[PDB]
Amino acid sequence: GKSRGYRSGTRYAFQRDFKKHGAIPLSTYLKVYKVGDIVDIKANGSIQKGMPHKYYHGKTGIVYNVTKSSVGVIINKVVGNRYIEKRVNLRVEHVKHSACRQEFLNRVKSNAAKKREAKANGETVYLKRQAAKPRGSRIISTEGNIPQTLAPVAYETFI
């Protein structure tokens, strides 16, 4: 007999963290979600209402609706050869703001601050990010660091 229920295979996914069971810290209920916010989805096993399906555990999406205790999040799911827009109603216990927005949002501020400062100084500044480049030339001092010669060691048994 095959089994394919709603929470099948979620034995460990929906578990609470070790030594983290019980009551929900109240910063979860004090956070404010606005339409357009990017949120990570992580089902809390101790709250069974407004709980996401196991597919959305670990997914990140956009808030589109705000209700009394829940937010609506838009997820794009692959169905065959295309994406289908999914609209999941989730209580805020299974939701947390995504930490990706802010890095962008700080880099936007830093670029704006750097551009005006170069504009203030009448010079130019380059704002595009760069991948790590190969390192330049360098000189290695040997005062106190004369090279030590190593050799491969013979085989030994230690039991």
Add this chain to the structure above:
Amino acid sequence: ARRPARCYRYCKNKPYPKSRYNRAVPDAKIRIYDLGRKKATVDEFPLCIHLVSNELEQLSSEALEAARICANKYITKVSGRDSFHLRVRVHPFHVLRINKMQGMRGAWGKPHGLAARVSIGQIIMSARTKDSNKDVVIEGLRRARYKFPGQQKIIISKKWGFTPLNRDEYIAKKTNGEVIDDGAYVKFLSRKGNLEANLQQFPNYQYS
């Protein structure tokens, strides 16, 4: 009754132990893992000799029992029953299955026997004895090697008996009062925890 061991040599299946899910499992043929003078103190038998597997393989409980009996008999016959402490270091916890005891429909087998799954470098048998009984104990294990399939090496341990310390570090910890007897084994001093209990347990502790 019992198939040839060649049918069960390799670790082809996941571990299938006794549990709440398989209950009608027979007992392993090997029940005794410590032989000889198992109550001897650590200082009596400094020399340790291992039989080590050079194979990722399964060894039946029948083979374990046979090799244990062979080694024990030979060593007690040649050097006496109180000249060694033999320990079998692998326990057969994996259940083999047999199907016929139609065809392939509903072919999930019944428990048939027990085997230990050994890796490369895993110790199968350990023998702590005196140095003068080396050639005897070695010859005791080399015969036991014949009861096993695959390749095994007889390796003389660098350590004192069944302890994790080398034969020089044990003497250092012994003259420093940093080890005490515990019957067949020993306890080592810890520099952590209740100071008073540690000091009481090791009166001969030359503190520095």
Add this chain to the structure above:
Amino acid sequence: KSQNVMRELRIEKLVLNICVGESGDRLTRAAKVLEQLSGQTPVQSKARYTVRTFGIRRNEKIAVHVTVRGPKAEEILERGLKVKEYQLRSKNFSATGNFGFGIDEHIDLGIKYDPSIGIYGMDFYVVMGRAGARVTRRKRARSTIGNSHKTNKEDTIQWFKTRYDAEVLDK
């Protein structure tokens, strides 16, 4: 200071138990005896499970017990110690500083005998404690009692011997 006023030992409560093995009229008369002795309506205890050997069944009203505090507890305790002629054993004191004894006839206490009532034996247990036990019993900020403030066997034994001029045996 070990000689502090608030470290004074004194009785917390006295619990009177009559475990009549059956339900019905006999248990009712034991409850009448307890309500007579204490002046308070007692409470009946139900069997937690069924034992055929003891002739009891689950949720059958078996025993009756009552808790008394204050001067009435002191009066009942000395009335019961008179029956024991002020001589307990060392084994009668628990490691937590509580003690108990058991009388065999309730007319020995000094109450009127009724043929309809009959005689019942009775069980006495005294819970000892110093001041400040409310910490462990209040709702908010419940905590534990410090080691020196705890009640133990020796302090209770010495306090009983001093306050009653009695003897604590140990046979």
Add this chain to the structure above:
Amino acid sequence: MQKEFRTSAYHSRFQTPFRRRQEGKTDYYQRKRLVTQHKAKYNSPKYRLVVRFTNKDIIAQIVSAHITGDVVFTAAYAHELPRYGIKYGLTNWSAAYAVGLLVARRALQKLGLDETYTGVEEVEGEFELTEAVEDGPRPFKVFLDIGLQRTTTGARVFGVLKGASDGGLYVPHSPNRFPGWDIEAEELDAELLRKYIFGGHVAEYMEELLDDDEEKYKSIFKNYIEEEIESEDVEEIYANAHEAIRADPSFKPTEKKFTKEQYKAESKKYRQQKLTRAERQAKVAKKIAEFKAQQE
């Protein structure tokens, strides 16, 4: 021979509760239900009337909760009452009523809703809720937070409730926990509630005890005796206190006999400070050597 229970694995796998739950001070279930706000009202806060009783004081605070911690809006203490004319019985039910009225009036002064939402100016003990004014801002809405204290008809927390309701704040409530509620005949006897508002029970105890035990009256009611305050003029003590509370509900802090730095320096002289690593290492060496005398 039983197994020792308190093993190292027991401590290793132990999950400690929230810090303020292990102190036994916060019921986080009730706190979650009180504080949590409708997510579609976003940053509009819920306001709590925190009511706490100590052995000597009544604390009433208007609080809104945030991630960095709770923030006090206003606060009225029972020890503020002597400024208003109540010097004794700072934990009466009537002292609770006075504290509730004071915190309500002080909050309304801070907001600016003084002339609007005066409240129940003629306290007759009738059940009443602060009704909104047409074509105007709604009354300041506050929900009661009694903490761990049990809900009983006659409890002192609902005295602060009635005071806050009478002070002009809108606090939703029912009258079946007030003193004077007949549970059999489900109506409120407003006469007994008004009696409780103006210290009627204490004055009646004074009168009933005085003619039955003068020595106990002398010990229990000392402060009244050296002030020559009888039962019949208790009511005036509250009626005036009420008036004064409505005249100037603003908070006046106690003038401090020392400055913050002087207080800190004085307190810093006591309380032992942790030993350096070297000191305890020397202690360990001494204890090892001093253990050598019991080698037998």
Add this chain to the structure above:
Amino acid sequence: KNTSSKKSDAAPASADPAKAKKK
């Protein structure tokens, strides 16, 4: 009148462990 209330939860007990004879 009044009676003791079930503080426990062993609804389908009707017996108890550890209660072994010959012990």
Add this chain to the structure above:
RNA sequence: GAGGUAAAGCGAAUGAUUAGAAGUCUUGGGGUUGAAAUGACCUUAACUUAUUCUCAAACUUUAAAUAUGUAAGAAGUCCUUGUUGCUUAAUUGAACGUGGACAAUUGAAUGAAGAGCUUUUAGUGGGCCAUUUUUGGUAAGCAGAACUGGCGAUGCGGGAUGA
């Protein structure tokens, strides 16, 4: 961000599991110390304590690799103040806006016979093989799954010969 497989762990929970040592007033028994004591002794067996050997697809604190969700701007960021019957104690917010500022390094790489969209219809709906992961089975040129690449549908050079 999510995950709970590999590995690892068991003097960490659960479950399995070898050996001694020291202890205890329910020790589980045998003998004698005994008038008997249940109060010692010799013993085995129980537990307790600190250790010891070995394990788990349906155990687990920890915890990969590979693989996976989202973001990397002009539909962006910031400033001011318009609309509502929603919301706030409110002149608070919510959403949608007027007006203004930030100009090509307009905010990573690489590529892009360009991107996007629609209608309509064929054949097919027996599959099989190789590496790796993997299940049943003693195994099978056996049966069954995962990912990819192939044969089928495909000739050419090699493997003599061979999907």
Add this chain to the structure above:
RNA sequence: CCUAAGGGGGACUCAUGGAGAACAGAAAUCUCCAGUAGAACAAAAGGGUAAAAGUCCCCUUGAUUUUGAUUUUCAGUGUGAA
């Protein structure tokens, strides 16, 4: 299968161990301490739950009405369930 074993609120805290109390003993009832859940939650198993979701008490019928939106299986059809 359940008028509660549904809903709300309140109070309390289980499994088990130790030490004690007449009959009473391995198992009756009473007391204290310890007790991270080692219990209980209708029924398989997993997850979840401790001033509770467990035990007890009080009041109830939200197991109600009108229909939309959404999640799973999915053709993004039905049904069931949420």
Add this chain to the structure above:
RNA sequence: GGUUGCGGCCAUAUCUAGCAGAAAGCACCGUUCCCCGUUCGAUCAACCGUAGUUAAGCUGCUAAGAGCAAUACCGAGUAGUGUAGUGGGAGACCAUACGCGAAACUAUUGUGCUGCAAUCU
């Protein structure tokens, strides 16, 4: 800086055993007419702040403490793994190449930080 009320993070805060704690606070503490709840004013309810106490709570310090937390020329570039070969080996399995890379172990350090309001030698 201490203390209280309300908190955020939720053990660097827990657990065990000792010792100390000025001021205020908190607390234990005293009583039962009243609202209220109990077998029991023990809990809960109310009254007094009057008769007493830091004994306990609470707070701080101590411990080659348990636990927890952090760090690393610790173990270990080990186990494992992505990718590769007409590599080795009868096989089981193993080596090498380009990459990623643990857990246990060992050692050291630390043992709540902090927001709003009020108050204090």
